[PDB]
């Protein structure tokens, strides 16, 4: 690959190495003030447009966009199919910028062809903490591929970060990329056997048997943490102790805020779903996952896979195989096919005893305006959504 576009940025290039004593910008000392104002220029016929998320019917474009043009997996076979109301909660987070949602129109049909998002927090980079976006939702329409929309779309959105004197950006992506900072293989653990093999996500053989595999995958539908319960509004305080306590440890994490623990945590069916253990007053074990339903392209039987993502975990009163557990079963009493999740945290140490298979293909970490050690991803503390 040339990478003729990433490596006028300042990112590493593909063969950069550095060690844990560098931890600091690539371009230092930078000034709103010289900040392009002009937006940047899209082909004739194109036109940027400003998203109101909150807008029904501006979110209800994006998610017609996402729905036909965003991820699918390598042998495209699924298409992410995020709900309009998971993409409200995901991108209207504490202190969200409108002017981050930028949208692209093909102006002759007023129609939305192209999509970027970004949101700020604090991220936390081998102990440093740094303000930073966090970019997400990045979508050309498929009739409109490799005409190079998608480096229009990151310088722009990259001018409006500046613009808000925020220098550093954290991303995720399939796609390698100069350079990562740390790479998560995903797994997965089968719920719904049947459906699973019905539309060839899971295999068969003479010796898994489809009554076998079953049977090799049922659950029992009773707790090891008896007293998981969905988190309210009370427990705010001990997630972000509880939450907050367990982050640090990482080499890359979000140092969530009190209201940020609210927004990202406190239920919402068909989005987000948190379970809490509470033992005198303290919040002692969390479970968390959201539901990220994929479109299985062509099926005529069944539209969606419903799978639901591992987010955040932590145990005090049980080991972490105990509570994985317990997410499974959350997930499968909440009517998901399958729970997936990256080999990040202490993710991976659960990963054969609780029956999860290996994906196809991994995601990458990265850090934009950021030179640093990678890392394994069992020392990685985010996950974006
Ligand atoms: C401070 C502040 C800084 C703020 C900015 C930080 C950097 C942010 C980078 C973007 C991060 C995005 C995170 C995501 O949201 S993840 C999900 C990606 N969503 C999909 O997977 C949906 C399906 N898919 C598509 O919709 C399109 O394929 C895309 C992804 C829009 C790409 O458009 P297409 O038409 O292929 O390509 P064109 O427009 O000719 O552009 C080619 C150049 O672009 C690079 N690129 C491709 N995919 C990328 C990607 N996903 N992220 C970043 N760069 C990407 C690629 O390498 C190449 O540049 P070079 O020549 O190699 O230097
Ligand atoms: C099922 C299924 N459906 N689809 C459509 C796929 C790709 C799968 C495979 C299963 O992927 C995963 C499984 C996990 F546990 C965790 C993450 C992913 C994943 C993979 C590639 C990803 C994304 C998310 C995102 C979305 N955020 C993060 C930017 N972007 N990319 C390029
Ligand atoms: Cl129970």
């Given at each position: 690959?040339?990478?003729?576009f990433w490596?006028?940025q300042p990112?590493?290039?593909?063969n950069?190495?550095?060690?844990?004593?560098?931890?600091?910008?690539?371009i230092?000392?930078?000034?709103?003030?010289?900040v392009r104002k002009?937006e940047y220029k899209?082909?004739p016929?194109?036109?940027?447009?400003v998203?109101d998320?909150?807008?029904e019917?501006d979110?209800?474009?994006?998610?017609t966009?996402?729905?036909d043009?965003?991820?699918?997996?390598?042998?495209?076979?699924?298409?992410?199919?995020?709900?309009?109301?998971?993409?409200?909660?995901?991108?209207?987070?504490?202190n969200?910028?409108?002017?981050?949602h930028?949208?692209?129109?093909?102006?002759?049909?007023n129609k939305?062809?192209?999509?970027?998002?970004?949101?700020?927090?604090d991220?936390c980079?081998?102990?440093?903490?740094?303000?930073?976006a966090?970019?997400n939702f990045?979508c050309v329409?498929k009739?409109?591929?490799s005409?190079?929309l998608?480096?229009?779309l990151i310088?722009?959105?990259?001018?409006?970060?500046?613009?808000?004197?925020?220098?550093?950006?954290?991303?995720?992506?399939g796609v390698?990329?100069?350079?990562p900072?740390s790479?998560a293989?995903?797994?997965?653990?089968s719920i719904?056997?049947?459906?699973?093999?019905?539309?060839?996500?899971s295999?068969?053989?003479?010796?898994?048997?489809?009554?076998?595999?079953i049977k090799?995958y049922?659950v029992?539908?009773?707790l090891?943490?008896?007293?998981?319960?969905?988190?309210?509004?009370?427990?705010?305080?001990g997630?972000?102790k509880?939450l907050?306590?367990?982050?640090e440890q990482?080499?890359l994490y979000a140092?969530?805020?009190?209201?940020?623990?609210a927004?990202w945590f406190?239920?919402?069916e068909n989005?987000?779903?948190?379970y809490?253990?509470?033992?005198?007053?303290?919040?002692?074990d969390?479970?968390?996952?959201?539901?990220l339903?994929?479109?299985?392209?062509?099926?005529?039987?069944?539209?969606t896979?419903?799978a639901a993502?591992?987010?955040?975990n932590?145990?005090?009163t049980?080991?972490?195989?105990?509570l994985?557990?317990d997410?499974?079963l959350?997930?499968?009493?909440?009517?998901?096919?399958?729970?997936?999740?990256l080999?990040?945290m202490?993710?991976?140490?659960?990963?054969?005893?609780?029956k999860?298979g290996?994906?196809?293909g991994?995601?990458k970490?990265y850090?934009?305006?950021?030179?640093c050690?990678s890392?394994?991803?069992?020392?990685?503390?985010?996950?974006?959504?």
């Amino acid at each position: 690959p040339d990478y003729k576009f990433w490596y006028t940025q300042p990112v590493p290039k593909i063969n950069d190495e550095f060690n844990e004593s560098v931890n600091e910008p690539f371009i230092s000392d930078n000034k709103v003030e010289d900040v392009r104002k002009d937006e940047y220029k899209l082909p004739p016929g194109y036109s940027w447009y400003v998203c109101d998320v909150k807008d029904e019917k501006d979110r209800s474009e994006i998610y017609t966009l996402l729905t036909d043009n965003y991820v699918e997996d390598d042998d495209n076979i699924f298409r992410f199919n995020y709900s309009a109301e998971f993409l409200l909660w995901a991108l209207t987070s504490p202190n969200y910028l409108k002017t981050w949602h930028i949208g692209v129109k093909y102006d002759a049909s007023n129609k939305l062809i192209g999509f970027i998002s970004a949101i700020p927090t604090d991220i936390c980079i081998h102990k440093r903490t740094i303000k930073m976006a966090e970019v997400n939702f990045l979508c050309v329409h498929k009739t409109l591929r490799s005409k190079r929309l998608a480096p229009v779309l990151i310088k722009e959105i990259t001018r409006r970060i500046n613009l808000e004197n925020i220098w550093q950006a954290i991303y995720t992506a399939g796609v390698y990329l100069p350079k990562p900072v740390s790479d998560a293989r995903y797994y997965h653990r089968s719920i719904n056997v049947k459906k699973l093999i019905e539309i060839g996500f899971s295999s068969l053989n003479s010796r898994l048997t489809m009554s076998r595999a079953i049977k090799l995958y049922r659950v029992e539908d009773t707790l090891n943490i008896k007293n998981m319960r969905l988190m309210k509004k009370k427990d705010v305080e001990g997630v972000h102790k509880l939450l907050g306590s367990y982050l640090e440890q990482f080499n890359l994490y979000a140092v969530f805020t009190k209201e940020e623990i609210a927004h990202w945590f406190l239920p919402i069916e068909n989005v987000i779903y948190t379970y809490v253990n509470e033992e005198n007053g303290k919040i002692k074990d969390m479970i968390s996952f959201y539901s990220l339903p994929s479109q299985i392209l062509g099926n005529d039987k069944y539209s969606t896979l419903n799978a639901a993502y591992s987010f955040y975990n932590v145990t005090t009163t049980a080991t972490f195989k105990q509570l994985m557990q317990d997410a499974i079963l959350l997930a499968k009493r909440n009517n998901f096919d399958v729970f997936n999740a990256l080999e990040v945290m202490q993710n991976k140490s659960v990963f054969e005893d609780l029956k999860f298979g290996e994906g196809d293909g991994s995601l990458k970490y990265y850090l934009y305006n950021w030179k640093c050690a990678s890392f394994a991803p069992a020392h990685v503390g985010i996950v974006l959504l």
